[PDB]
Amino acid sequence: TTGRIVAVIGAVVDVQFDEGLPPILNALEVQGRETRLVLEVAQHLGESTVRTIAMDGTEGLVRGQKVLDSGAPIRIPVGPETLGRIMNVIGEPIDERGPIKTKQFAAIHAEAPEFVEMSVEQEILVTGIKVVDLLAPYAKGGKIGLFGGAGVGKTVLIMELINNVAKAHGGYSVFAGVGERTREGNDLYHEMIESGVINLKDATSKVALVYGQMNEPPGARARVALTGLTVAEYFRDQEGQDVLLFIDNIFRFTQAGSEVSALLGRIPSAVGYQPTLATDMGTMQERITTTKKGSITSVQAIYVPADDLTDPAPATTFAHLDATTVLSRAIAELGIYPAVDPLDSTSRIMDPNIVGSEHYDVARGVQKILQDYKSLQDILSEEDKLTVSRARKIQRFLSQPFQVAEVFTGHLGKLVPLKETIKGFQQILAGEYDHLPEQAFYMVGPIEEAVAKADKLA
Amino acid sequence: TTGRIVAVIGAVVDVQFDEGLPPILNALEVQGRETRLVLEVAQHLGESTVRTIAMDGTEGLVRGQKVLDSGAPIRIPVGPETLGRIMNVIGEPIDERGPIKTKQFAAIHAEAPEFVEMSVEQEILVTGIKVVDLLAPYAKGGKIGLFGGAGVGKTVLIMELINNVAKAHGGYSVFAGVGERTREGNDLYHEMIESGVINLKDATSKVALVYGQMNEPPGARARVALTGLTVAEYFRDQEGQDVLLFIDNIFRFTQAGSEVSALLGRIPSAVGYQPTLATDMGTMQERITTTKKGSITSVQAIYVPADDLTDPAPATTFAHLDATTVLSRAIAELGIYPAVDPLDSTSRIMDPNIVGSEHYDVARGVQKILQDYKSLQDIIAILGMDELSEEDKLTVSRARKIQRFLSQPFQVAEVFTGHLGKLVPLKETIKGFQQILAGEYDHLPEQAFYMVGPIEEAVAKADKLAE
Amino acid sequence: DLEETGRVLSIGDGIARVHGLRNVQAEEMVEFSSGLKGMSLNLEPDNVGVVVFGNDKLIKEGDIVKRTGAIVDVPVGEELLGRVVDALGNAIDGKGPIGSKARRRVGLKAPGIIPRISVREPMQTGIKAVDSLVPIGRGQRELIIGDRQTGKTSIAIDTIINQKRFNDGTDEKKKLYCIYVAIGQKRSTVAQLVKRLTDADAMKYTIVVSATASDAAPLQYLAPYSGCSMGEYFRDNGKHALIIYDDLSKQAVAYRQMSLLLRRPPGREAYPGDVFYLHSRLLERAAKMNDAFGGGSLTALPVIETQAGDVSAYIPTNVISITDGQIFLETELFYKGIRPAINVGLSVSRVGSAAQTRAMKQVAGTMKLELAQYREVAAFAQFGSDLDAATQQLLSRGVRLTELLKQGQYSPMAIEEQVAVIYAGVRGYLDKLEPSKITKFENAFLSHVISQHQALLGKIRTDGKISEESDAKLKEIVTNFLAGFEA
């Protein structure tokens, strides 16, 4: 049925309906406008009136203006045709390339998979990136906190992850820019085109882009992660894939939720966050998981307010994380790429029961030697001098050329299988390459390339 | 036109009018009162009802009591005959010397001078106070603010400024007592009669006094600053001549507003303040200004609640100033008076192009040595002075002497210090700090520098402390 | 006619609640009987909450309020250059009417993803610390942030003054038109500001939009957007504009006043839930356009005032997150003698090298690393008399480079002059010189190379780097000059 606007207060719009009231979460379409204005039902106020949150600016709205109940929550194009495209929170193309011509659409509000659908399988998602796989491996259906941002090669790591997962698992990616700076959204898109992870000329794109930009109202920025989630859910639940979902960044998800809660007049909780902080987080996060059909695995850029790890926002988020990838400027200034901190990055599935016994020991060994190296940096005996030379060559072997960096660096990128990663670091820990130089281990793939680089330095 | 009181809660009085509703800011007169009770219109509530703020106590008011619209905002006497007199918020004499025999009056609400009316001239006003003249000098016709928590020295400083600058001033002065101690008003009044600045028998008085102290309800405290500045505005625009305006304490204007804010039906902003704190302040402060027509050198004492300079009241006040003198309990507690923070006081004219490079260099040098010492203090409190290089411990000893040479006995503070007051010429201030920085007194004891006037007295004190 | 008009139900604290006006649009400007304007921010079932653009003494219960087909726009164009205007583009400098032929809405959407290209053209401040270590390009949004009196406005003023050389030049491309938005300041401060720019001969390419402390809250709320629209005229016509918002802390306070008085729900620090949206809408309108859209740009330098150094307060947090980078200023740095008081360690520009010329890029990379290395060790500079030569050299070099980032006011530098000074520090020529004499050295050194060695400076800019021959000539000038200076 058709309702009428009765109140406009900023990004909050009240609509009165004579017949059937739209349920909470339903998308309403404002009539008589240039571009599509969507309102999401938030509350039933009584007296046939609903409170709604606007997805775009509310300037120019008049009391009595007509509003159509769409009969469902926000519904967006899902399918292969989203790949390489950029949509907004309401599923519109924003890349000026025409309609996203999918054969299916899907509601952005969906319940998390039921208990019976849970896969008790604790499986590693191989990224083909040496630091990640060995020392802080990704778990299928898990969430990974990505720390850092500027000058530490975040976007290149993202694109290589997109590349590697598609190449090795046949799984696609979704990038959700939550509070995306428009300049950086433009940059990312063009960097993806140049790296080849988006193709504008054929159907071989590996990522669907979903942007909720910073200049959009609280409602839009709060829901855009769910839009990304819904695109990802299609590839898992319809095509049985192991899907990657990027959320950049998870704090601005929480921030937009807080803004929305404030606008709806809800009393703020500790530190000014929404009272629904945990439930807002949980209903989104729980959709990221392994099910019987496949999985969605999620890399989530985390901003930490006031560098306070006990702040309610990061504290609530951490409850959902299974791993961390810590990108460090200190590692970058040593020339090691990717600039992953091999000591700070952790993974719950670094457990002898889950990963190999070989995996666990080699990782624990590499962890111990790099720790011992920093301890022996202050101060050596024959046993100590042997471990210092081994750990330095292990520092270099954690570096790796990326396929995504091939056009810029000129050097060939390497995707390293799990077992090749493990054996390479293992053999250094056993000292099979103590006879070989130090800089022969810098920027190679499998350990055989390090042997090949050592021959070239003769 | 006539109204009737419909509600009374503290200082907030609601009045209903059957016919012509009085505009916001209008003064209303309560009928059947022993002394004049003014209500100022603050809001139109609807239903022919206005919300008002009382200028005096509301005890004895009854629902139904008659109220007359005066047809204008509060209007007060202005002109020459205010000089030597004491007035209250509504312009009544409170010195028991009979009527203010003026035939010129002015509304206490007025528009601020426009952008085109601004003057950019800025020349130093020497105070003879070492810390001020050296580091953060005052400007003639400029806006001066004295910040401080309770009991740290704002009033003592303003009284010393009155002593050093106002007593020999060739134009007119206005002192506005806003939400402060009545005892201080009486002290000041009799001091000015003694100094001849106020004369009770002839027409030579140079100071106009306006008071609404902390015994008054918030309405009086909210408006008395406007009353005082309206007097000053007359002297600026109609006499033209150079005006000095002292306000103690301008915070009390904002505080009075916070006292009534909830009863005016407002959601609070942060720290209990009225949402309108900044615009209220702006409309008042922008009138306190030199213009092309005339100069006002304004000195405003600015209270700092809970010693927190981030408190919305003082925080919002900074932008309205050309020179800031910030006092500190942490400094006062050491016996360093005046308790000026050398690392938190600034001035527009602290510029090498204005004060000359020698003045600027010594002031920046002083601030550097003091900031360097402050950053070391806590490290050497644990690791010990002995760990420092002879270079670092040289700057520690020097900084501690500079801290002490910044202290000064005030003429108005003799009853607190036990020392005779000292006024130090700018040249001597500059020279003294220059010499200490250059290491010219590295051989002298720290204490020789404490609580003296010129540098020669430190030298003289060094001999006296020997035997 | 309660569809196109209404009546005041109540008026107080700059809020008129109006009965009727049934056909008013959200955010539409309406007119009171007195002539005062108001913006319709709250459309409610039984009233319109109207914010008052003026003194509410002139509004009474029962007053008629009318729709007028009003559009909240401002004059735009080259005729505003050299002019001081209010929040609505009215001349307040007394020099008569703006000769405006074009106008633009104050509330417009930013360009989206597609019309933009990556920021790549230097926006030169002439301030060594910024241009070398926190580089700004055209289209960037770079925050200037710090406590009261830490030197925030001065960064902006030097930046504006710096554009004179490009603007007096013939390279129509390097030219940058400037807009200074003053919000909540006192009128005499703004007058001092304009005097400074006039004396610098900077006014002729600058527009001053001013909504001062006694201007009503909605006027202060609008001023940034008005300034922005004026900037956008240049951006969309293939030209380049720089806008300064001094400051956004004061604009947020004005908006909070209105929001609270409209009884919108208060959040942290009593700010409304849409306060981020307030600044993000504004700051996204600064952009770099691709060639298909004319290739113009709008660069924004918002200013934020922190309280007792709290960069994690609500409004600072918002603008920090929105912008492409931040210049952090600190009081202890200021009084230690670090002026401009930039904390280089914390300050950031995500655009980075892309905004730097080859000449700057060849010296800034080294300075960045040597200072970064110095920062790890600086804690024991007055306590490391015994440690080995390597960490002694880090301190010696780092303390010297720190002095070279100090700069006086009102004299922004050409890039060639900047790199010539940074060259002397990074190649080690000043490693033996007493740290406290470096500022005095640079003043005299720069005056010497400008006065006599204009061929050398020209060559540095001609080549776009310091060549071997330029390196040789610089080594002889510096080493001989230093010997004479430390006598």
Ligand SMILES: Nc1ncnc2c1ncn2[C@@H]1O[C@H](COP(=O)(O)OP(=O)(O)NP(=O)(O)O)[C@@H](O)[C@H]1O
């Ligand atoms: N210059 C000074 N020399 C010596 N003692 C001083 C000086 N200034 C202040 N004191 C001492 O501290 C007391 C408080 O100073 P005063 O100027 O009255 O404080 P204030 O900052 O105005 N406080 P308040 O009015 O309560 O906000 C004085 O009565 C003296 O005892």
Ligand SMILES: Nc1ncnc2c1ncn2[C@@H]1O[C@H](COP(=O)(O)OP(=O)(O)NP(=O)(O)O)[C@@H](O)[C@H]1O
């Ligand atoms: N590079 C510099 N060298 C020396 N002095 C400076 C420099 N930059 C600023 N100053 C001085 O420092 C003082 C404060 O600078 P200003 O640019 O007003 O800072 P601000 O943070 O904008 N102040 P406010 O807005 O009043 O809180 C002024 O007196 C300047 O003249």
Ligand SMILES: [Mg+2]
């Ligand atoms: Mg006092």
Ligand SMILES: [Mg+2]
């Ligand atoms: Mg400033």
